[PDB]
Point group: C3
Chain length 166, copies 3
Amino acid sequence: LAEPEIAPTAYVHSFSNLIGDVRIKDYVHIAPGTSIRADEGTPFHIGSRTNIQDGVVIHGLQQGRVIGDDGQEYSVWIGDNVSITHMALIHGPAYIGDGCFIGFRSTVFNARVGAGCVVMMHVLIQDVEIPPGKYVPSGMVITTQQQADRLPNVEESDIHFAQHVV
Amino acid sequence: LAEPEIAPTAYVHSFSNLIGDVRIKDYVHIAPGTSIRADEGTPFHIGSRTNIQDGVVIHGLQQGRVIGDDGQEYSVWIGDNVSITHMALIHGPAYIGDGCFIGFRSTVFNARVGAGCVVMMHVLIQDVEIPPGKYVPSGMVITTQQQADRLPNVEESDIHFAQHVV
Amino acid sequence: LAEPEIAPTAYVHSFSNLIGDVRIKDYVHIAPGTSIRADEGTPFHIGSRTNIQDGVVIHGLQQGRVIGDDGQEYSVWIGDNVSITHMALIHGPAYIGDGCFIGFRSTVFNARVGAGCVVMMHVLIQDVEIPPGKYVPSGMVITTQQQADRLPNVEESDIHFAQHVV
Ligand SMILES: [Cl-]
Ligand SMILES: [Cl-]
Ligand SMILES: [Cl-]
Ligand SMILES: [Cl-]
Ligand SMILES: [Mg+2]
Ligand SMILES: [Zn+2]
Ligand SMILES: [Zn+2]
Ligand SMILES: [Zn+2]
């Protein structure tokens, strides 16, 4: 496999299992107890200032890609200023836009989550595109585009909550 | 504890925490970031060509067994050609039949899942027997036999989905 | 960071990632595959005879504390005789009282769970106080005090179930 590209200012804990073509930008913080393996789906991108918390798994399917902001194909693209919090599962093909909060134990698989979404705890997002700036309440199981199209806009209280966690 | 029995063609990543009387058959693939410990409930069986993905925990209660296909008692029996996908929890007593798909973050505990079931994501299966060839939609919490008895049959689209993941 | 205080009779598996001011009392059993890190929120307390099972993450927010039974501030306080079972997430600020059962894949975050509660599987408890002696059925997503105030009392069958798991 190709080697990870780790920006000089990124922090990757030695207990993180990081393998393959994972392109990690400035000031990223990857906790211990994380798995980020581009051994099937590849490449991955993790944007600047993004935090990947303990218990997270990031993996991808061999087949299936999203378009990154650079126009290249990725198995997993996670933008800048994203929080991928404890126990989240980000499974390619997946795009998570800048500034998203992905709350505890939530999954994004075969999906696009637009910039500035606040996804709460114990959520499943699969097989859909969520436009920018939407809020997903805890426990929701979003598997159809019709559900995704009903989601409310992020309100100030949702941003404040996400800020208080991160 | 007894030692694992690892078939010559099985792959067990060095980062897997594999302990005790775990009987692993041909062409099994056990990922890093897995825990498969027969230190309480024992023995375990993992059938041929089965894949155990990163984030999975397989454990068992000291008391409580299922009958394996060899007539012996097991804490956990996982059949041939099974996919135990990311973050699944298989907790003995548990039987998972040949060809099952157990989707991301799903739990099987004190239960029997018949051959050829397709269990989707974020599912709980506990204290029930699911007959062969049933589909469990994402997010379902199955804790009673009445619920298990309502499950739909696997359709071609469900098999195709499972095939596309695996 | 400060070092953990590990009682002479406590068992902490060498594969546990235990860091910081974590105060672990008599006969605690911490499994492999656990993460218990007081590197942000601190301190933590884990009371006597408590079991922390494989797959658990215990972490805390830098800001936000609960009052422990000693009157001191903690990010996470887990009492005596508690079972924190596989894949549970206990995230500070959090108080879990003596004798609680926290079932598989359940989360307690920014919450107080009174002594003697039985919390089942795939539960979210967030932003609430649960009084002592309540039962939380599997799959419940408790995010408001109104929901917490509706919970049933633990019945003998719930205690028996918890006993059969632990
Ligand atoms: Cl973390
Ligand atoms: Cl999980
Ligand atoms: Cl894997
Ligand atoms: Cl354990
Ligand atoms: Mg883990
Ligand atoms: Zn995968
Ligand atoms: Zn166990
Ligand atoms: Zn945290």
